[PDB]
Structure 1
Amino acid sequence: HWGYGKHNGPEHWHKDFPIAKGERQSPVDIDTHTAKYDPSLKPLSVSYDQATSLRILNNGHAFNVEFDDSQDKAVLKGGPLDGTYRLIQFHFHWGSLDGQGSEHTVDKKKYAAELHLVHWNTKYGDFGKAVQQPDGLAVLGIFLKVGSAKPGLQKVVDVLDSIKTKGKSADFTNFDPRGLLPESLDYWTYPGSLTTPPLLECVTWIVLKEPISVSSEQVLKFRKLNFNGEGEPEELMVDNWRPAQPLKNRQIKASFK
């Protein structure tokens, strides 16, 4: 099946998922000199005080910190969004080197990693139905640069030893995702897609302008995970990012001047 290697990577995905060459694919390069400030965009509303994390899973492509999305406990609203979107999970995409790893780029700059907090539109009832709609998901993307450690990320880094391989999961309760946010909520937004198969064009992307900083030791631990399952040849989980796709007929809007 699909992956990130030379024979099953992003350049091959279109054979099984033709929408890979679609009109609103993600990620994209964010050209800061052409994004337009939109004074009508509202401040984002991130309400994570009642967030309930449950588990962390290595799914063979990344690791997902899953939340209870059976109630409106952790929701995203406002910004370019109409309605309420519930947090279902967050994960990261990262590189083999600090100079690459993010999916979105800013003026062609690649960050060491990118965090995606995935939310689905409650008007569709469940994640599976939401991904079949143009406004089904809202993903909050946050860039990671290497420098000072991010205290709020350490609990995630420390549990990785227990989910080293594909299919492994571990209890991960009481994790506060607010500890992964930068100070500012200024953002860019554009209509896009899932960045891994099925690549459905169901995402309102909201990418924060301010990166968070993580330490080299923290990212190094992400690179010790495995794409493979236990007992299989070790293939380090690194460079699990899709490169920038054609913007085509889309405009990226900025919430700030």
Structure 2
Amino acid sequence: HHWGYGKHNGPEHWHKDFPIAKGERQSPVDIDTHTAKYDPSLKPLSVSYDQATSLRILNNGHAFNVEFDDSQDKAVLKGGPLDGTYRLIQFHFHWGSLDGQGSEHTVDKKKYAAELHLVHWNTKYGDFGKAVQQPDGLAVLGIFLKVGSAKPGLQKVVDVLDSIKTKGKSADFTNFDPRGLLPESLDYWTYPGSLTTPPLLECVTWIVLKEPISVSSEQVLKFRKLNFNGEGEPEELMVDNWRPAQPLKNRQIKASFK
């Protein structure tokens, strides 16, 4: 029926409706650190989020997205392995039912408690919908979350979750600064891949940061209180909304550091 993360509609079934699921450039992948090639030609990333405008937070039934105004070059990513400017459109997380799982990408097979995705689209394509049809249409910054100390900058997000508990609910979410979610270091790995939920389009240049951010147990606990279902439907907690690692196939992971 429609896709999700359960036993009957989970990632192992997606290929029946989205054949690209068994494509040549699917994500996520395991990052083997000893096989990643340091590339001295990669430039440092340039994150300009000082003019970011958040607008709303929404429970879409598979995660929660914070959306931004992308009508102008307000929050952009450039540099790194990218050509051109990429505008931030939304961020969302993937998390687990337990602290030892939740991330999509793994490092030397290590799974983190969660993974944040900042989604950006290539301005040369004019709109998001046109960007997904192109091999270099999106750039996703992935950041791992480990449980330890609370992350002050994530608290405003944690606190509004009660108001978007079920699928289809949304809340005004203005003035949130995504700079409070970045690690100290911008060292990263990069590879060509795809979106990790249907339609699984292979239009993404992934930028995965080496340094995780810490969140407290209580913060991640609130994520696990969300629901997959809509209001008045039987309760199914929103947990484990992560796709397992896919075959690397003909791809090289490059490192911006040694």
Using the size of structure 2 for normalisation, the TM-score is 0.99
d(CA) in 2 for partners of 1:188, 1:174: 30
**Pairing of 1:98-117 with structure 2 (within 5 A):** 98-117=99-118
Instruction: Report the CA distance between 1:180 and its aligned residue.
Output: 0.2
Instruction: Report the CA distance between 1:178 and its aligned residue.
Output: 0.2
Instruction: Report the CA distance between 1:6 and its aligned residue.
Output: 0.4
Say yes or no: does 1:50 pair with 2:51: yes
Question: Residue 6 of structure 2: SS of its match in structure 1?
Answer: coil
Instruction: Report the CA distance between 1:126 and its aligned residue.
Output: 0.6
Instruction: Report the CA distance between 1:191 and its aligned residue.
Output: 0.1
Say yes or no: does 1:86 pair with 2:87: yes
| Structure 1: 5+ residue stretches without partners | none
d(CA) in 2 for partners of 1:114, 1:76: 19
Instruction: Report the CA distance between 1:230 and its aligned residue.
Output: 0.3
Question: Residue 182 of structure 1: SS of its match in structure 2?
Answer: coil
Instruction: Report the CA distance between 1:19 and its aligned residue.
Output: 0.2
Say yes or no: does 1:19 pair with 2:20: yes
d(CA) in 2 for partners of 1:137, 1:62: 19
Instruction: Report the CA distance between 1:53 and its aligned residue.
Output: 0.2
Q: 1:223 maps to what in 2?
A: 224
| Structure 2: 5+ residue stretches without partners | none
Question: Residue 119 of structure 1: SS of its match in structure 2?
Answer: strand
Structure 1 segments of 4 or more deviating over 3 A? none
Instruction: Report the CA distance between 1:103 and its aligned residue.
Output: 0.2
Question: Residue 12 of structure 1: SS of its match in structure 2?
Answer: helix
d(CA) in 1 for partners of 2:71, 2:58: 19
Instruction: Report the CA distance between 1:62 and its aligned residue.
Output: 0.2
Q: 2:129 maps to what in 1?
A: 128
Aligned residues: 257
Question: Over residues 28-70 of structure 1, what are the superposed CA-to-partner deviations in whole Å (9 max), with x where a residue is unaligned?
Answer: 0000000010000000000000000000000000000000000
d(CA) in 2 for partners of 1:219, 1:125: 36
d(CA) in 1 for partners of 2:114, 2:5: 15
Instruction: Report the CA distance between 1:5 and its aligned residue.
Output: 0.2
Question: Residue 11 of structure 1: SS of its match in structure 2?
Answer: helix
Instruction: Report the CA distance between 1:9 and its aligned residue.
Output: 0.3
d(CA) in 1 for partners of 2:197, 2:130: 17
d(CA) in 2 for partners of 1:125, 1:235: 38
Instruction: Report the CA distance between 1:153 and its aligned residue.
Output: 0.2
Q: CA RMSD in A?
A: 0.2
Question: Over residues 177-203 of structure 1, what are the superposed CA-to-partner deviations in whole Å (9 max), with x where a residue is unaligned?
Answer: 000000000000000000000000000
Using the size of structure 1 for normalisation, the TM-score is 1.00
Instruction: Report the CA distance between 1:21 and its aligned residue.
Output: 0.1
Question: Over residues 126-147 of structure 1, what are the superposed CA-to-partner deviations in whole Å (9 max), with x where a residue is unaligned?
Answer: 1111000000000000000000
**Pairing of 1:239-250 with structure 2 (within 5 A):** 239-250=240-251
d(CA) in 2 for partners of 1:163, 1:62: 11
